[PDB]
Amino acid sequence: SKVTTVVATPGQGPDRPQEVSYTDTKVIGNGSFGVVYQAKLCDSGELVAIKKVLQDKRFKNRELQIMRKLDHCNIVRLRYFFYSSGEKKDEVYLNLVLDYVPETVYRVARHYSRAKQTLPVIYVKLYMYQLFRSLAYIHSFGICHRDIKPQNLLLDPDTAVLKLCDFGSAKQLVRGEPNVSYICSRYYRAPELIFGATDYTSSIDVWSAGCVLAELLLGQPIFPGDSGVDQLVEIIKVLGTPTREQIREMNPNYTEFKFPQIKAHPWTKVFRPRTPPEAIALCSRLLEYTPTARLTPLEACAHSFFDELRDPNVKLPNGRDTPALFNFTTQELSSNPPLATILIPPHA
């Protein structure tokens, strides 16, 4: 019956410290600065994940500053935060108390893949649409996640609700101010990042998202490899070798290098024959060399592949109705407001 009380600040709320009690602590994972716990808030009985990160004594923690501003049904909610000692002696850790979500897109995808079954397309639609909304939302603040991958897509597999998490690499990108190129995880990295660009844009998240879509359709990553060399070969095998004009749009330092000379594989042969053609069309507009030619997240939400979700009679295969899909805010719609008349159907 072990109960722990700390002074913590609500993640949103007013900036007023309060007493927070929790219990039933258990290890659920490990992060870069110590293990990740589950706990149960005594007040409400709700489950939270508690994650530790390093507090820099010179600047404010960027991940905390971003999470305090975010309020969206497809992004993990920051419930509280507080400071403590930790794994390394003499160190002060930031603890981020997040709403707990028990599964991820990756687990669901591996479950199907290992059974040699295709994830039913209605779930590919639901998951990718919610991912794109979360991206349109954070991108409308200038914020790029920089680490989109299936393991960062939390999932309630009963309601089909998805929530984007892990804002440890996220950054408000300012044009003309360089960024480190070494973010984003193996298999999901845009080619401009593989080339070491420091002047990239939020479209690196849309590439990563297209990689997640392709993986859901293929049952395995589309561009695997343990080095950027091997990853690039897999990209070139699908997209063909980039032209000098494309390389200049990615990283102009790379324009004159010798790359493998390979003609593009047709998109209709990248996926199995019965892949829905709208899914292939959408993929081909996300996995583009030229960063500015990729769909924006909000253009992706309005793509024809997601038309079934705007059908008034669409339901989950388990007979539940779909999660919330159309409660767009002005903020979320700000990159292009008149997509809302595709985005919000008459029945909403």
Partner: peptide, 10 residues
């Protein structure tokens, strides 16, 4: 490589 140690899919 998984986010969590435990899954209903295991």
């Amino acid at each position: 490589s998984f986010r969590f140690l435990y899954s209903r899919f295991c």
